[PDB]
Design a protein around this ligand. Structure first.
Ligand SMILES: *[C@@H]1O[C@H](CO)[C@@H](O)[C@H](O)[C@H]1NC(C)=O
Ligand SMILES: *[C@@H]1O[C@H](CO)[C@@H](O)[C@H](O)[C@H]1NC(C)=O
Ligand SMILES: *[C@@H]1O[C@H](CO)[C@@H](O)[C@H](O)[C@H]1NC(C)=O
Ligand SMILES: CCC(CO)(CO)CO
Ligand SMILES: CCC(CO)(CO)CO
Ligand SMILES: CCC(CO)(CO)CO
Ligand SMILES: CCC(CO)(CO)CO
Ligand SMILES: CCC(CO)(CO)CO
Length: 138
């Protein structure tokens, strides 16, 4: 529920940790759903847990984002509702909007609410490029 210990019976199996206390911090305003920049990158290298802060927003969007936002081509949003503190690590689908289809690609993401009023996200690459996990500045 509360801890990430790695995949059982695998080399990556490791000491358990609380994601709320072991994440990569990203302050990348270009992830904003309101960023229209012509540049396009890809989150293909993401791994582990992430916390988003700054002007771009502190959470993923819960609604489909228009294409060519978040400094990417196909933006990714959370096809679910954020958990409350106490719900533990929750399993969700992230959807990428492309070619008239708000879920043209999909992938699993984990989400946990944390003491202090923030969320962390477990993000393992992307299913295609150029895709990125957006943040909603609202
Ligand atoms: C933090 O997470 C990384 C990636 O999952 C892991 O390799 C590392 O052992 C963790 N560190 C601690 C202190 O739990
Ligand atoms: C995912 O999005 C679809 C389309 O907007 C919606 O019908 C469905 O209920 C959503 N799923 C969750 C778990 O929110
Ligand atoms: C999340 O749900 C999918 C679909 O049921 C499943 O394949 C996957 O193993 C789940 N992830 C975890 C960590 O349980
Ligand atoms: C996907 C399972 C698990 C490890 O990868 C998620 O944190 C369980 O600890
Ligand atoms: C540091 C995060 C990142 C670049 O912003 C590289 O993994 C995400 O794509
Ligand atoms: C109504 C807006 C939208 C869905 O949220 C489709 O045009 C944006 O992707
Ligand atoms: C809904 C009950 C409960 C688990 O989700 C709230 O955190 C009880 O611990
Ligand atoms: C959304 C993917 C793509 C479409 O032209 C742009 O990165 C490349 O296949």
């Amino acid at each position: 529920l509360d801890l990430d210990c790695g995949a059982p019976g695998t080399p990556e199996a490791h000491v358990c940790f609380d994601p709320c206390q072991n994440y990569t911090l990203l302050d990348e305003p270009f992830r904003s759903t309101e960023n229209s920049a012509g540049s396009q990158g890809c989150d293909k290298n993401m791994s582990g847990w992430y916390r988003f802060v700054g002007e771009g927003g502190v959470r993923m969007s819960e609604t489909c984002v228009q294409v060519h936002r978040c400094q990417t081509d196909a933006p990714m949003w959370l096809n679910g509702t954020h958990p409350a503190l106490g719900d533990g690590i929750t399993n969700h689908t992230a959807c990428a909007h492309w070619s008239g289809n708000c879920c043209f690609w999909k992938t699993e993401v984990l989400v946990k609410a944390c003491p202090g009023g923030y969320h962390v996200y477990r993000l393992e690459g992307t299913p295609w490029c150029n895709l990125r996990y957006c943040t909603d500045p609202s």
